[PDB]
Design a protein around this ligand. Sequence first.
Ligand SMILES: NC[C@@H]1CCCC[C@H]1CN1CCC[C@@H]1O
Lengths: 237, 300
Amino acid sequence: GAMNSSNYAELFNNDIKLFVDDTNVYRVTVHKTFEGNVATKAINGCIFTLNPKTGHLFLKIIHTSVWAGQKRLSQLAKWKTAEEVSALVRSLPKEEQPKQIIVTRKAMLDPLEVHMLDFPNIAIRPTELRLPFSAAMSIDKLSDVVMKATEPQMVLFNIYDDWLDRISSYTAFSRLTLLLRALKTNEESAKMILLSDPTITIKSYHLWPSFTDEQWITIESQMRDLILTEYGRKYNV
Amino acid sequence: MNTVPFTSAPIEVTIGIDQYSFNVKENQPFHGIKDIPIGHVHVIHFQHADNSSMRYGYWFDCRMGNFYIQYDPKDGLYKMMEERDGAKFENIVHNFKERQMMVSYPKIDEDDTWYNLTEFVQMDKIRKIVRKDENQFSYVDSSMTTVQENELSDPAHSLNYTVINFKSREAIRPGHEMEDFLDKSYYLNTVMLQGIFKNSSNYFGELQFAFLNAMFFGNYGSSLQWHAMIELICSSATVPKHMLDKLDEILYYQIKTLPEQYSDILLNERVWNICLYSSFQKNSLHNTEKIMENKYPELL
Ligand SMILES: NC[C@@H]1CCCC[C@H]1CN1CCC[C@@H]1O
């Protein structure tokens, strides 16, 4: 069934599952033409496919070339997403294939189900959660590999960096969601917080700064102030 | 014209013949139905006065034998049976006609309704959906489940409709996942029409038979089958012009004949709005859409 507040710990059990988010697959800028009409220019996008237990991110870069000569791009994007997740699963050894795939938008259920007919024992689930994975393009390194790509490409990142050496997947997921929620609500502040202290560095193959345990609790606190605050500035409370 | 005599009417029952029905009281002197038009299939069906649960009946074609009804007090229902002694049958019928204890199939001469509901329905195909080969007639009731319903429990009592499933490997060609799912023309024209049904007439006869089982017995899986066969045509961008034109006539008479007050259970909001307003054929069902809008504008 659907994934929600109540069956949330299932993400951290030992059954392999992937989250799929398709919100950054099809991306455009909107501009005016010489005749004063409006047109879109596509830019590179990406499929966000995440193992929430291990932190494995199978970032498939969607190059603008996949749209050339296509119609109805918003709909094509959902089938293209499903084509790529299916290809990923197929490329995986049996013991590494997910038992479940959870899509973050219900529009992805039918495309993925149809592309995964060959895998009847993989459950395709929706979720009731309003997860902030769209803000993945507010992570500098991820946005950078996407924008620089000149061809279709699959890049790997551990979105948890090295965190699991010290904390559990449940805690790691909670940290990630808080950071992404912050980045989504106020990208400028969120980033200001993360990078205020020049001495804290980001490791070449990491995404986030190398905070000590104590520095993460402060950061996490400041991201929570951010998310409450922007809620006030938005709702006047 | 043909006759289906009854031995007697021991229990109060509403008897139906095609789209006509009449009440018979317990032990009322009733010996059957005469003047039944040759050349069509028919259905005679029953709802006991005491158990509105279980409607039940027999699909039959008089050209294939002499058939009669006899109450069975052990099994508690009206059973169709075949009389093989042709002389004993003409004999029984002629007496009952002489004593005028038979109701007359009450066909108005202007009315092509039954013909248009059963245009493509053959007994040979009915007997493949309802398997009971020792009899020439076919028993259906309200509660019989379909082969596809049994996939998702007694197989001898199943309705063996052709399984349609829009999210199945049969429906979806590897590599055409989006194309085939958004435009089911392959599934309709190649898998089902060319492959399983062979021609549009056999497809339309199953469709029509599913509708009638839904209408007359409230058979839920028949209703599911009728809506699926409609939806596959409406969701195909490429349909022979002749199939569309006939479809519009087929569905027009089904909608016209449906009981006004049963429409809320037998008609699937999603399929009809999709077929009439969103699907590739939204512009190809003029008669069906006109009658749907003037009769059931609520469902839309
Ligand atoms: N994000 C890095 C991951 C671990 C190390 C490098 C590759 C992936 C491995 N994943 C998990 C198994 C299937 C897939 O190949």
